[PDB]
């Protein structure tokens, strides 16, 4: 009865709640409502056709100072999703910070093999606003352990399911 805990980290505003809503419920709103608290949605998933699982996807506030649950957010995760916004250089520069935050709080026994997935969200944005290049993102993903990178739009439903299937796969791997 495979239950997979996935947590999503990243700065305030990058699209964490939007990517979860898109994946689970296919909903998206242009309006911004900052996440208060921590909670999860549920998605039934199968990996490789034959491996049935329930994925619990957890979402809380982006900035650490408004992360109400604290350490308990991180505990027992099978995969950590790290999200930046391609229109915000600071968010991208914080991806290593978030990876490090997780490894300390989740006290993982094999940091070099624990599953992270990087999502560069907001790929639909006006081109002149897009200030983080895919090349930089690929360079960071290599340098953090050859972790998978997906470029996504929660808004226009680009690559969100594909990303989450790799999150699911890699969480199953870890959980087993
Ligand atoms: C719909 C109006 C419109 O066309 N706007 C133009 C560009 C919109 N691009 C765009 N692309 C996406 O893929 C987006 N995902 C989310 N958002 C928007 O950004 C704001 C923040 O979203 P949240 O999911 O609330 O971010 P989160 O990380 O969850 O913040 P905290 O809780 O941590 O604070 C929202 O306005 C959302 O619509 C995209 N926008
Ligand atoms: Mg949110
Ligand atoms: Y869907
Ligand atoms: Y911290
Ligand atoms: Y080693």
Numbering used by the authors: 6 to 181
List sentences quoted exactly from the publication behind this structure.
Proteins of the Ras superfamily of small GTPases regulate a variety of cellular processes such as intracellular transport, cell shape and motility, as well as differentiation and growth. For all of these processes, switching between the active GTP-bound and the inactive GDP-bound states is of fundamental importance. We describe here the synthesis of reactive acryl derivatives of guanine nucleotides that are able to react covalently with strategically placed cysteines in GTPases to lock them into their functional states in an irreversible manner. Extensive analysis of biochemical and structural features demonstrate the maintenance of the signalling ability of the modified GTPases.
Extending the labelling experiments to other GTPases, placing a cysteine at the position equivalent to E35 in Rab1b led to covalent interaction with aGTP for all those tested (Rab5A, Rab6A, Rab7A, Rab8A, Ypt7, HRas and Cdc42), albeit at variable rates, but substitution of cysteine at positions corresponding to L125 in Rab1b only led to covalent reaction in the case of Rab7A. In order to determine the structure of the GTP-bound state, we introduced two further mutations in addition to the cysteine at position 35: one of these was Q68L, a position equivalent to the GTP hydrolysis-deficient Rab1Q67L variant. However, Ypt7Q68L hydrolysed GTP faster than Rab1Q67L and we reasoned based on structure and amino acid sequence comparisons that the residue K38Ypt7 (I37 in Rab1) close to the γ-phosphate might play a significant role. We therefore introduced a further change at this position (K38I). Structural comparison of these adducts with Ypt7:GDP and Ypt7:GppNHp demonstrates that the covalent linker provides sufficient flexibility to allow the covalently locked proteins to adopt similar conformations of the nucleotide-binding pocket and in particular of the switch I region of Ypt7Q35C–aGDP, Ypt7Q35C–aGppNHp and Ypt7Q35C,K38I,Q68L–aGTP compared with the non-covalently nucleotide-bound proteins. Despite this flexibility, the electron density around the nucleotide and the linker was well defined in Ypt7Q35C–aGDP and Ypt7Q35C,K38I,Q68L–aGTP, whereas in Ypt7Q35C–aGppNHp this was only true for two (chains A and B) out of four copies within the asymmetric unit. In conclusion, the structures of Ypt7 modified with aGDP, aGTP or aGppNHp are very similar to the non-covalent Ypt7:nucleotide complexes, demonstrating that the structural properties of GTPases are maintained in covalently modified proteins.
